[PDB]
Amino acid sequence: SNPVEEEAEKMTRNSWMMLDGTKTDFHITVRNKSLSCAINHIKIIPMNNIEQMLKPDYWKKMPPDDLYIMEKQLDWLSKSCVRIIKLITFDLELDNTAVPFNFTGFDLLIEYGMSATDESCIYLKKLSIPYEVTLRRTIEV
Numbered sequence: 511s512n513p514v515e516e517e518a519e520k521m522t523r524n525s526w527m528m529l530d531g532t533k534t535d536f537h538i539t540v541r542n543k544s545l546s547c548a549i550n551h552i553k554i555i556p557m558n559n560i561e562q563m564l565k566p567d568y569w570k571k572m573p574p575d576d577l578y579i580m581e582k583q584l585d586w587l588s589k590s591c592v593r594i595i596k597l598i599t600f601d602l603e604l605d606n607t608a609v610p611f612n613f614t615g616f617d618l619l620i621e622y623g624m625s626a627t628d629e630s631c632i633y634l635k636k637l638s639i640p641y642e643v644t645l646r647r648t649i650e651v
């Protein structure tokens with residue numbers, strides 16, 4: 511047998527406009543039992559996944575049936591932006607959920623943060639945070 515040492519390592523409804531969020535959560539026992547933060551993350555805006563999905567899917571405009579986007583976009587029916595913090599509660603974590611460029615049949619952003627201050631450990635205990643939101647559409651042409 512060969513072991514080594516055990517290491518010491520809200521459903522918002524935004525109506526097609528800008529918004530905000532705030533996250534200060536004490537699910538951060540991943541280095542020395544939730545002492546403090548490694549380094550900050552001052553209000554990271556999440557709208558870039560659905561920007562670079564909702565732009566080129568309707569800028570496909572090649573033959574759309576052969577699916578050069580060949581993998582299924584069932585995991586792109588949410589957003590799941592990420593904030594992997596560097597080497598108590600969550601110090602700074604805000605996100606401007608801007609629905610002003612968004613689809614009409616999506617639900618959430620399962621936002622996963624790699625909580626560890628673990629220098630190249632390949633170990634980082636990533637805890638995910640959901641939203642389970644709903645969109646009330648205001649206008650169509």
